[PDB]
Amino acid sequence: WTGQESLSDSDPEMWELLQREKDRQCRGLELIASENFCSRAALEALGSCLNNKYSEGYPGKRYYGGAEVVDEIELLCQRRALEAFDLDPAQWGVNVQPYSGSPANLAVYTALLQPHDRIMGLDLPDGGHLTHGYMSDVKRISATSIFFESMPYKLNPKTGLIDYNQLALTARLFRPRLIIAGTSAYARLIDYARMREVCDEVKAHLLADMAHISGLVAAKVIPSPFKHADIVTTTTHKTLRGARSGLIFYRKGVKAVDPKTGREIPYTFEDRINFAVFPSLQGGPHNHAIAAVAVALKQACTPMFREYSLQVLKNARAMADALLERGYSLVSGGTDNHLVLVDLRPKGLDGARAERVLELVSITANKNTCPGDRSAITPGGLRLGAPALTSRQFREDDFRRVVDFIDEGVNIGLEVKSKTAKLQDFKSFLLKDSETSQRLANLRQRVEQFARAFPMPGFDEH
Amino acid sequence: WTGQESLSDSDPEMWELLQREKDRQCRGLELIASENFCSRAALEALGSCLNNKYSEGYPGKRYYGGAEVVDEIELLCQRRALEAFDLDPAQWGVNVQPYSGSPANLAVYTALLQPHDRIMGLDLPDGGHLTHGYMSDVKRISATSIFFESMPYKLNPKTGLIDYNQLALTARLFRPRLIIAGTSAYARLIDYARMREVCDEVKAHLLADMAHISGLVAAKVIPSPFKHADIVTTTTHKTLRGARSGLIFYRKGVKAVDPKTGREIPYTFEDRINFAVFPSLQGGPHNHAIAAVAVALKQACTPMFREYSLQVLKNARAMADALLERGYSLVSGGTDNHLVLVDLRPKGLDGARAERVLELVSITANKNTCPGDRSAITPGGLRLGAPALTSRQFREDDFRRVVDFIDEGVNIGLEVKSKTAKLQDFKSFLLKDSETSQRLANLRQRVEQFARAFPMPGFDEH
Amino acid sequence: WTGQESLSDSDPEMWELLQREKDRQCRGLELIASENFCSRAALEALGSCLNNKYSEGYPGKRYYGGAEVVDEIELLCQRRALEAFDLDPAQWGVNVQPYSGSPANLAVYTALLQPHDRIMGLDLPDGGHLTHGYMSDVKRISATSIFFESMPYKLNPKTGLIDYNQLALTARLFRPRLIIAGTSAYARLIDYARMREVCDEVKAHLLADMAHISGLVAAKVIPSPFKHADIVTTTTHKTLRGARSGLIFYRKGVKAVDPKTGREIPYTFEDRINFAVFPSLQGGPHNHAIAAVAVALKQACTPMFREYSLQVLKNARAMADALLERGYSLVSGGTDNHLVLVDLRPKGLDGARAERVLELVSITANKNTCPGDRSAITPGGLRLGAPALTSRQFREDDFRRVVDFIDEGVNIGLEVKSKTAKLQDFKSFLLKDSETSQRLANLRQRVEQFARAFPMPGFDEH
Amino acid sequence: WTGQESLSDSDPEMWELLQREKDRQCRGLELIASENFCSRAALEALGSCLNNKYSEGYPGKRYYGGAEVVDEIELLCQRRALEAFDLDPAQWGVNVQPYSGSPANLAVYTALLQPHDRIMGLDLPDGGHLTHGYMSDVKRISATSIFFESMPYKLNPKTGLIDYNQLALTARLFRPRLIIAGTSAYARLIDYARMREVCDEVKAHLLADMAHISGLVAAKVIPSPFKHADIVTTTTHKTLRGARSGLIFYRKGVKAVDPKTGREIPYTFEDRINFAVFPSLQGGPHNHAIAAVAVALKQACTPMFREYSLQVLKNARAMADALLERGYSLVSGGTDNHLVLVDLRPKGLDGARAERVLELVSITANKNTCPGDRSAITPGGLRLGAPALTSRQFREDDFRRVVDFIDEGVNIGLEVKSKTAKLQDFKSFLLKDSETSQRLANLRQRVEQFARAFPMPGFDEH
């Protein structure tokens, strides 16, 4: 046994599952706003020998030895991270060891906040993520609501935008020490200048969790949160189109000048955050992922990525306006980023029903709670994403054809809402009914034909 | 753009770093007990297309759709995890989603404990990991000691073994709710029966952290902690030779019963463990790693793995006895697993000077706090591991000459510890001198030429 | 030494200070809304042999023995407590061991809330007390903000009333587990029905801290909070006119009927609260104070107390309307209880200046932050109280004469605001200036003559 | 109405209870180590007019005005507190505002500690108070163990003394921030030098809870804890024979210094202690109690108090030796302060049966957990105190016959413990029987006739 034999001969059970998943990505219309297709160059670094190195510590501050090469790799990733976002190295440092986006956000809270300290993020049904301190009316869901007392700020349901007025009002009463300026399901631009004004008043840090929009920020196609944020977290996949990991951008330099003393007061983020990632929360970093992050980061500084992110915005608004003409309403009217929020309620269907419909025809979308409905009620909306297909060289009229395939799916589900009463009656009827099964199969085959014709990043085989 | 271009074509700067690290892994004698060289079969699954599937949730209880293929990959990983350790799927469950070993320990704490609940782990200078609630006299280090109240149990300084009697009394006073039977530097077996003894008396949970010895337990060599531990956490690399991920095994079924209780009291660990990983602490799973650990988990059930595993212990005694027969005392006198705990205080050197002179000759080890270290600044001990090199087909005689370079390394470091008083002047002499550099430059060529013969698991170029 | 010799012969230094304080109360116009003059019957029980009994435990559940008489005393106080507030013993129990009002409120939080659990009380500059979880923008002031995470609700400055709308809105976002419905500086009636609607929605307990208005509630001259509150705390002095202590009224019986099961769900307040007072927070109760509380409680159920509390309301509105005619504005227009909130800002003086002015003429009032000013700015208002003078048989035209003495004091301070610039210049000028000293002395003597003519509860001597 | 009517005139039902308790105090032999009969001088100050002054704040830093007389009463109490214990007003301060002893301990914790900080006190079965962080295996009891993390130190079961060596090791593991040298049931002195030994090593505070021995320290009999303890808390009753209140003595001035530190490191306990009492935990001070404890504090400096104090220890040895010379073993073998720790396991009875038979004969004691109690249900030991009866001019021969009734009491309880198996059947036999009732009814008449001769400090009727 040498360990150098291919997976096809070593584990045929898993190598088959690898090809079955690769076919699902090639034949399906991946419409989930958070999903992207990683390039082969990064995946070659993700599954490499760098797995075999315990580089506990930091470049130049390693607990072990033999970290000669991984130091150059970890340092290059930091330089490529700051270069991709046009950050000045004297004003910005970056940690590249967060295992994913969720451990990245908890690292920032652990670094700058005591247990039970207060944070404020957008509510989960309003568009914020779990890691922004989401808790329900019965249970503390995210561990961010357990180790820290979180109060969410909500949207204004009349406009679908963030209620920046109610945020400033409740921040004065709640007195949070950290406010999250980032979303998971939000089709509009976050007013980071308004977030900083609130944070400057209540003496709170401004964290920008740009996971969904990091690629657009790196391409400078949307306003960059670094102009106002103190700490900036992001996943390394999604719009960045890299391996699953996370980054933590922090301000280094001088915070401000002393008022009555006239003295430069420094920033104390680097050593607090770098200590929170290790040895507080994590252990040995995944140098294979760090390298893969660096490969995708190098791709972000290229005119290729500027054109790709630009096409994402064009595809998203092309998908938005196409949805509007067919009779669909959208949260906040349309989109200014990479995703659109469809409101299926004025069309007679809920997101939980339509997502199962689209899932059976290889169209992976996700239900979304629309502004107004009290969360627990079956979500009457969907969240659609552009970066996934755009990575496969999708065009505007290609996304317009995507909307056509959704219009057929919604109508198929609409005919089942009349033939059924409950959601599980809806789910089972889609599989057991004779006529409804073949029309789902016909739409699926027509979807898979159109989807397979486009390219696909990564390996041909897996 | 395509995304299917090679790494050597698109990013040459990163491709050279990949080979420089692979050549460094081949040219050296990796002796860190936590390191291991993963197989190519898992590296093909690690850098696969599964990085592009947000499968948040659990099989059958997914948050999205299109999780058709990733579900059976997680369930095959769950089945292979219980099968490798010979666990009844009716008595044991597993979570295959923890990003690494450190997130696996934080998850079970959040699952079964409240903030500031009492935990007890082995002290880091005594051989415990950070994740076991390592607290200092100066500061809180691990987040396990920040979000939870931790009191460490120590070793017997005269025997070098865990002071089970001191633990038995301090537990009745500290009144912990969970005790960790983990090990990062302890060359003998842990009386899991005596730890269930203490955990049942103080009514606490017994969690086994077999991350360092997990393949030795999978190969049914050393006794298995699953007889006693209610919960078992593990890293997927180290002894199992897999990708970097984590596992959380938990007892499920029936705890006890009583005719007074009416029926049976069930094990309620499953839902708590799973909820703690997602949606509490983590988010989107790294199913590309889950696939790679499923690959290595199937390898763990093979007759080859037990053959490889037994050689690790045989090389452990080979390294221990050869070190003993050269003027080196060992903590607890020898080894009984995969690692060896040297004591360099007799030889005349310390751990910090030795791990640097040995790292400068492609023999990577690590510092270790030995029982009786009169100084915390510079510890007098290393820790050398068998699993790393044994994966390159290392017999007992192969390890018996790796200690020859070691003994030559410490003697070189001994002939400068007198020439140079302080460590920072020590470290500066190994490269500013014309003689000591030649002394080390010639040692590692015979060291790299000896290492390069054995084949390296994984790819050839990277 | 027998210990039975009087204080006059034993400690002449303290017996003189006793008579000097008694003269200050007899000669001064005690206008502090929280102050009252305890009767001699209660003071005879406050300074009695009951001090010498350690009655740790509860009637029938004593840790010691010999509690035969103090059990009858503690039980009679409970019966007189429930009788004074027209409470049904099957619906209401009461704890009589809180040392004061502040330890009473912390007992309720400790009983029903975990550490760092959330509460909501009126902000301190808005009228709420410290024990309602007051914290500043720099420091956690009250220990209620340390052991529990408190968010305050504020008044509506346009009307001076409690912002019941903003309270309901922020309660949904903050999700508190206990809401305080009680004030220290608030001249209007609390809408307990609206408080219960908010608490019923966010699944929170409704605590009514009726310390300032307990006597008015016992006389049934204002709406009783027991109609809506779950737990009711109160000091035993103030409007109750008793010895310094506290009570905790809790609902006993059935909370509600099971919705889907049809079953009576009990109240679990008694044993949680009684355990929080002892042995959690306190030790041996002050049986001398408990007895004194019972003496004053017996007086509360009498037609005398109904007439006294009625005269308090008449005196307060007589003081209010008198203040209005002289050109003074009042927060929320006037008063519906025992105190008025004067706004001195439209008259050219602040409360910090006027209170020092009135203090030098034996008129003890307190400055009050008026709705609008950002707390730290020198308070431009005063809080005036009726129960203190009304206990001395003050009439409406007597309080109208009280307002005349305040009008002279304000005008004396107004002439110093022009002659000074800072607040300490104001304070020192009142004492060192020749002309300003005699006019303060003339007003003081005229105040002390008019004040000494009225009766005074308690002993003649001390 | 007037308010100056007598208690016997207005409330006769309460006046009869006052005499029934006073007659019970006179007719019995109070032997509880925590009880004491306060002097009339302090009872006149306790039930004085100072109950009617909200003096929130501190002298010179009051929140209101009119605090002219109450300020010098608090400062005289502060001066008398330092003078009684011979404390330099430059090295020691005092807070005379804690409502009782239990609030005094909670205040200093809030002053110097954060929530869930580590504290260490004597276990309650070993002789520690609740306020020392008493935690059980089943539940958290004292709020000191809820709001703070507590680990108890134990006694040596073979010696009956504090296990200073077990404390010395568990402290290095628990890493506490404050250790309490308090005692509720421990008849020997505490090595405060050896506790400063441990507190200086683990860098923790040393707080002395001399509540039980405070007058013995004031009379300069037993050694004073003020030599070592950084902070000292105390109850104003018990050994000092004062009203029920609390005191918090704190070291102020200069901690240490260094030529490297430039100047001197000052003691920063004063502002933390004072702020914790008000405005953190308490509110309006009970200056009527503060006056009464100032009365008894002046008595503590008299040559009479030292004469009274010495008799307490002389009566302690008298009670201990007489008990030893009658077939009673004592914990640690005798006494060296004010209390005695009997061990009734040799005699044949237990604490629960003995404290009831003795309470039924006007000899009030208390249960006590003796080292080696094979059952927690029924402890085998009482605790009898000298300070209570010594305040009635009890010589050594007077106490030597109080044990005669005790020995007669335990023998009566011994002759029924065989007649009645279970305790609830035991307790029922002392009143349902015609013989045992006569056995006890005749014993207490000789017991009450013996007690009634000695005069009672305080008033005559109440």
Ligand SMILES: Nc1nc2ccn(CCCc3ccc(C(=O)N[C@@H](CCC(=O)O)C(=O)O)cc3)c2c(=O)[nH]1
């Ligand atoms: N805008 C936004 N869109 C998305 C899309 C995906 N995500 C990631 C988070 C997905 C998620 C959210 C909530 C729960 C959850 O609470 N599950 C409990 C319910 C129990 C109870 O609530 O009582 C259960 O499974 O039982 C689980 C997973 C986000 C996000 O974070 N934000």
Ligand SMILES: Nc1nc2ccn(CCCc3ccc(C(=O)N[C@@H](CCC(=O)O)C(=O)O)cc3)c2c(=O)[nH]1
């Ligand atoms: N037996 C055992 N062996 C090993 C081998 C590797 N590891 C994992 C890493 C161990 C480790 C311990 C401490 C720190 C650290 O950061 N220490 C400084 C703070 C830094 C500063 O700012 O100077 C401090 O303590 O102050 C980092 C890593 C283990 C383990 O956990 N256990």
Ligand SMILES: Nc1nc2ccn(CCCc3ccc(C(=O)N[C@@H](CCC(=O)O)C(=O)O)cc3)c2c(=O)[nH]1
């Ligand atoms: N409506 C209302 N009226 C009254 C009237 C009396 N009280 C009782 C409470 C009085 C009180 C309030 C606040 C502080 C305080 O904070 N002092 C710090 C400031 C430090 C900082 O804020 O940074 C210091 O002394 O330095 C102290 C005492 C109340 C009440 O509770 N409510």
Ligand SMILES: Nc1nc2ccn(CCCc3ccc(C(=O)N[C@@H](CCC(=O)O)C(=O)O)cc3)c2c(=O)[nH]1
């Ligand atoms: N050495 C020492 N001697 C004495 C003498 C008096 N005291 C002060 C009071 C001691 C005390 C201890 C325990 C409880 C208690 O409430 N126990 C139950 C819960 C009740 C239930 O619900 O059954 C439980 O533990 O479960 C109450 C009081 C002390 C002291 O503190 N120390």
Ligand SMILES: *Cc1c(COP(=O)(O)O)cnc(C)c1O
């Ligand atoms: C390897 C290991 C871990 C996990 O470390 P990571 O760097 O997070 O993979 C935890 N505990 C012990 C004892 C270990 O050996």
Ligand SMILES: *Cc1c(COP(=O)(O)O)cnc(C)c1O
């Ligand atoms: C996508 C996203 C995440 C996901 O974090 P993972 O650790 O990758 O699951 C978290 N937060 C926000 C705001 C996101 O947009």
Ligand SMILES: *Cc1c(COP(=O)(O)O)cnc(C)c1O
């Ligand atoms: C008396 C005493 C206290 C205070 O008890 P209270 O009932 O609150 O007065 C605290 N600790 C010890 C050791 C005591 O002896």
Ligand SMILES: *Cc1c(COP(=O)(O)O)cnc(C)c1O
């Ligand atoms: C008067 C008042 C208090 C005072 O409590 P004390 O313990 O007596 O100082 C507390 N809370 C409220 C709401 C009050 O009105």
